[PDB]
Amino acid sequence: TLPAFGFAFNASAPQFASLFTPLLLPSVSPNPNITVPVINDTVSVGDGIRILRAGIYQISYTLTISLDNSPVAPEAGRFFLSLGTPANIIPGSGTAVRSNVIGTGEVDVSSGVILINLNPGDLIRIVPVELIGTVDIRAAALTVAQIS
Amino acid sequence: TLPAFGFAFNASAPQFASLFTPLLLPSVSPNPNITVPVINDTVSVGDGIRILRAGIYQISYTLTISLDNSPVAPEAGRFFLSLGTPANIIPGSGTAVRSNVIGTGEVDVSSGVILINLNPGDLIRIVPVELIGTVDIRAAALTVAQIS
């Protein structure tokens, strides 16, 4: 049987990060020639991916983060993957960024990869858990791929 | 059947990013003890990987990017994976970096992971699509692994 997988992303709609608020991931169709959902036995719900098949999964997320130092300097965010409710964070999935206190204009990329046992009904989302300032998420992506 | 895969990288030759110009990836042999091509039913062409087998693929890329703020400040780059011609970018694969307008010396890492349906003949490359300044790509890497 082909492994379960899913890919959800936001390529064209920046969003500001809010505490314990899952990032929006409206798209599932990355190939520009044969443009179809890259989904097999998972469900993209609009802010993440729901597992339908118990198994071991490799999960990645990638964020492009603009910390322009307005209206406060520095700006910072700490992000995790969450299982179910947004506060139910996954240790091992955390990443964090912070700008310099001087100047303006920094844009950074955070990406993380984990492996995790998951079960039917588990909802995987990207959640900001600590924020300073207005943290602009220019793009976001979430990959889920069963190891089998 | 073993999944198709390929790994192409540039570990020892920095290159400046140019618009719509695929990054050079001359090496395929990462193990320092048993130093062999990590290639199975793909082809490394020198600036990316060509697919030979239809399937679902997890693709990653990793870049170490020096934005020294010379000759302009800030410096910035936006990168995507491309399918076929360099302008045929893959939504969901984008990353971007930008230095502070003040000071000098920033070096950043961008990494992205996607899942994508691909077909025989598809050529996957890393492409800069927007640039400010002289963006020094100190190291680059591209992984392609079929999910099957």
Added chain:
Amino acid sequence: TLPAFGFAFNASAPQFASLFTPLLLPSVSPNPNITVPVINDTVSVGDGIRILRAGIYQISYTLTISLDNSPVAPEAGRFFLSLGTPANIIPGSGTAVRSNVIGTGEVDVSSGVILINLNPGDLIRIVPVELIGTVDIRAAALTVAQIS
């Protein structure tokens, strides 16, 4: 047969980077609901993962790096995965970060993904190979997943 895999991380104990000294990765159990080792035919040794099964592996690492510019500015680190002894670095796995020479407070994420042929007894670890200053590794993670 299910692919070999392992996940080792450090979520709750920052460590400063030292030359040729593998980063500490004490945890293997990321799911907060069903909290179990995500290990199959590998061994987590406390500073990395030992391979038990010959095969092709996708390996990732993710670091959250604080470069506060004290006691020197800038601060910088270059990291690789190592095979066996810490100086036996894997070309293609390198990443590097450096702060601005001005100001303070930068926190960056580095993540890298490779594919590699590996053999029983191979020990995979994350190693700093060049350092400037006191480079604070706030969190670290290492994924190993056989492609089969």
